[PDB]
Amino acid sequence: ACVNQCPDAIDRFIVKDKGCHGVEKKYYKQVYVACMNGQHLYCRTEWGGPCQL
């Protein structure tokens, strides 16, 4: 379910909240993985409640 991944092991996840999705019209968070090897790679989108916009 993660798009990019770490060569050997992941260090942590960084969660960035973006508010209202323009297409899906739901709250969403962009999820990244911080690797031990390199740094930040986009992992996935996490969906929240329905949305106003």
Q: What angle do CA 38, 3, 42 make, to 5 degrees?
A: 55
Resolution of the PDB structure in angstroms: 2.2
Distance CA 46, CA 6 (A): 20
Indicate the DSSP class of residue 9. Answer: -
Amino acid residing at 16: K
Whether residue 15 contacts residue 45, with contact meaning beta carbons closer than 8 Å, is answered with no
Distance CA 5, CA 26 (A): 26
Domain ranges of the chain: 1-53
Breaks in the chain after (C-N > 2.5 angstroms) = none
Distance CA 2, CA 35 (A): 13
Distance CA 24, CA 29 (A): 12
